[PDB]
Structure 1
């Protein structure tokens, strides 16, 4: 019975779940490890039985443990239990989210936040730009993408947005659905204001002189809303 390391690990997990189940039958309130093991082992056994789908198992995993079956703080600690179970149609990842309802008594590692909002990009004035997505797919723009060089299927006054980025929480994104028109707030890019990469429209220091080169490049490459004069004077390096 050639056993793989994965099978040995799953056997250990199953017997941890069996121990947790025996303790629950004895009436001991389960801790974090026991609760996680119990849920995972139950999901594995159901998948092996093969009468349920992954969706059914995701639903069923949330009914195994009542709030009174676990110690205080376990429900807060357990956010989701993932387990790769072998179904009749192969191995699938079953994820059970919030399997236990929080009692609220004890919250390990809980945050005590101030009731004051965080002002991001303080000292930077934001301009408003109307953007239309004339493409056929939605477009997501990150907080730190140079907005001048975004997807050429977005239509807006690129001259207004040269050297700027979205004024949103860093790591968040703004989605433009096709055909949809949105108004976004843009703020100047900080630091040295050296734009490198992106669509290679600037690849240099962002100033008024590089703005003309960037606009001409965008017009040549077909970026919507980029307006460059027909009689454009080239530089020695561009």
Structure 2
């Protein structure tokens, strides 16, 4: 047979699903493990039969278990069942999203939230800058990127954005479709304001003296919207 470790794991999973199906036949309401295993084993068998596509199986995994077939609390615990199955065209990942609908009141890990909003970046004044993507490719910018050093294809008044980042939720992003034009809010970067990396445009302390060096470097490297005055005077370290 030359079974691999994967084949042994999948055989164990198939028989866990078989046990789940037997218990469902006996009239027992399935718990979390049984529901997960039943969905996974059904998907594997369907993929072995070779008569359905992976997308069909993603849709079919959601009709196996009605809400009355599982215990209270089960539906809210199974966000997604992923299972890798071998189709005639090879191994594909099938994920079933929210296979079971909630019918009871039990929610394990239920979150009870205050209805008050969170104020982020408190004490930081936000300026508004209009930005246009003159390139032919999409550009996405995160919350803590130094906005002065974004893709050179974005065009905006770079001088007003020095030492600033997007005033959005941490870990979120703003997208710029090709040709898209929109305005964004920028707050000052906090901490020591020591900007290293990102395009190597600053790589030092952020201040008015280093803003001139950054503007000159940006203009030399073709960053759009950069207007650094001609007759630039170099410093001893650039």
Normalised by the size of structure 1, how large is the TM-score? 0.99
Q: Per-residue deviation at 1:47?
A: 0.1
Look up the match of 2:176. 176
Partner-residue secondary structure (3-state), 1:182? strand
User: What CA distance in whole angstroms lies between the structure 1 residues aligned with 2:8 and 2:90?
Assistant: 18
Distance 1:28 1:151 in 2: 59
Q: In structure 2, what is the Cα distance between the partners aligned to 1:163 and 1:36?
A: 50
Paired residue for 1:86? 86
Deviating 4+ runs (over 6 angstroms): none
SS at match of 2:82: strand
Deviations 1:176-226 (A, max 9, x none): 111111100000000000000100000000000000000000000000001
Match of 1:194 in 2: 194
Deviation of 1:138 (Å): 1.0
Give, in whole Å, the separation in 1 of the partners of 2:95 and 2:87. Answer: 14
Q: Secondary structure at the match of 2:85?
A: strand
Distance 2:231 2:168 in 1: 37
State the alpha-carbon separation in 2 of the partners of residues 72 and 111 from structure 1: 17
TM-score, normalising length: structure 2: 0.99
Secondary structure of the 2:152 match is coil
| Structure 2 counterpart of 1:223 | 223
Q: Secondary structure at the match of 1:62?
A: coil
1:102 is displaced (CA, Å) by 1.1
- Residue equivalent to 1:75: 75
CA–CA distance in 2 between the matches of 1:104 and 1:144? 42
Deviation, 1:104, is: 4.1
CA distance in 1, matches of 2:167, 2:24: 52
Residue 60 (structure 2) pairs with residue 60 (structure 1): yes
1:31 Cα shift?
A: 0.2
Deviation, 1:230, is 1.1
Cα RMSD of the aligned pairs, angstroms, is 0.4
What CA distance in whole angstroms lies between the structure 1 residues aligned with 2:76 and 2:114?
Answer: 21
Would the alpha carbon gap of residues 104 and 127 (structure 1) be closer, same or farther in structure 2, given more than 3 Å must change? farther
Q: Which segments of 5 or more consecutive residues in structure 1 lack a partner in the other structure? A: none
Q: Per the alignment, in what secondary structure is the counterpart of residue 111 of structure 1? A: coil
SS, match of residue 28 in structure 1: coil
Gaps of at least 5 residues in structure 2 are none
